[PDB]
Ligand binder design. Structure first.
Ligand SMILES: CC(C)[C@@H](OC(=O)[C@@H](NC(=O)CCC[C@H](N)C(=O)O)C(=O)S)C(=O)O
Ligand SMILES: [Fe+2]
Length: 329
């Protein structure tokens, strides 16, 4: 008795080119979806998602328990105090089913100025041994740049949709300092599936992850073809159809702040499904010092009564708050 959510498929290919009128017609579709359910599928995006899924599968099914401890974030391994964001997030058999691997900007090297200053939210990525996972690091770093390029084009569409010049968001989204992350999430098939790893919503729906708003400017997600996401609308939680050929896009709470809730961060949750599947989000984050002055496209003078918030302040506070609300992933 759950209605299907309206999640339009938008051909975003004009956002990579120079046909300005064509780009405005894409921007209108982004505006409409952002004002409706808050979700859309970006199609004709140019990324080889089948290869992404194959390379990610090869990694998840070959990594060993030894490697997981050696790559583990601080929540699982006290020896790794510098790893708050980047590294392996272990499962706990009988208690926690999901496991994942997160990496950040490949330009965050030991010599990067923010790494030298030990600025919060910046970390040097950790990678498994090359002989054990041949080609993985190179593939994953190239994927970061492929999805960064898609995300820059999507940000041009959001800017045009809000009545701004196309580089309004994209000028703060740069290869040398973006705080964007990739997460390679594995949701396992388990027989028997631990009840401790299943949450229950107030409406009785079985979930893997509770309701939340994303901590991002926008979220650019690839998932296997297994339906699982739900979005809260006025008519209740609705099912978001799977589409393993497109990227599912939504706004995060930084976009809601900047637009004075004109483009809301949709509240959504992840249903429990007993299936072996992948979920590969790219969280589009700006730079640490990036500050966009808030505005309101519903008001004639475009002024907002919100205070400017630096992206760095937003992000570190948001990641902690999400772990406190919905648990350590
Ligand atoms: C989006 C997908 C639905 C997926 O969910 C996420 O990745 C979950 N994000 C976070 O935990 C924030 C992870 C932040 C990451 N460590 C970082 O440092 O930048 C959300 O549900 S959003 C899933 O479960 O399939
Ligand atoms: Fe989310």
């Amino acid at each position: 008795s759950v209605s299907k959510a309206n999640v339009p498929k938008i051909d975003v290919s004009p956002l990579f080119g120079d046909d300005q009128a064509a780009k405005m017609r894409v921007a209108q579709q982004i505006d409409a979806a952002s004002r409706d359910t808050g979700f859309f599928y970006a199609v004709n995006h140019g990324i080889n998602v089948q290869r992404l899924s194959q390379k990610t599968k090869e990694f998840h099914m070959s990594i060993t328990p030894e490697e997981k401890w050696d790559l583990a974030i601080r929540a699982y391994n006290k020896e790794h105090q510098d790893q708050v964001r980047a590294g392996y997030y272990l499962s706990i058999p009988g208690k926690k089913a999901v496991e994942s691997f997160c990496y950040l900007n490949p330009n965050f090297t030991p010599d990067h100025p923010r790494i030298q200053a030990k600025t919060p939210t910046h970390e040097v990525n950790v990678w498994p041994d090359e002989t054990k996972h041949p080609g993985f690091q190179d593939f994953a770093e190239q994927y970061y740049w492929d999805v960064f390029g898609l995300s820059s084009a999507l940000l041009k569409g959001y800017a045009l949709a809000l009545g701004k010049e196309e580089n309004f968001f994209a000028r703060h989204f740069k290869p040398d300092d973006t705080l964007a992350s990739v997460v390679l999430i594995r949701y396992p098939y388990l027989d028997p599936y631990p009840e401790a790893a299943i949450k229950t919503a107030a409406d009785g729906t079985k979930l893997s992850f509770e309701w939340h708003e994303d901590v991002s400017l926008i979220t650019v997600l690839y998932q296997s073809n297994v339906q699982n996401l739900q979005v809260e609308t006025a008519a209740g939680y609705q099912d978001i159809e799977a589409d393993d050929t497109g990227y599912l896009i939504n706004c995060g709470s930084y976009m809601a702040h900047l637009t004075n809730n004109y483009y809301k961060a949709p509240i959504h949750r992840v249903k429990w499904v007993n299936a072996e599947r992948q979920s590969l989000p790219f969280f589009v984050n700006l730079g640490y010092d990036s500050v966009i002055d808030p505005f309101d496209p519903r008001e004639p003078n475009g002024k907002s009564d919100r205070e400017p918030l630096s992206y760095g302040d937003y992000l570190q506070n948001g990641l902690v708050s999400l772990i406190n609300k919905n648990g350590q992933t």
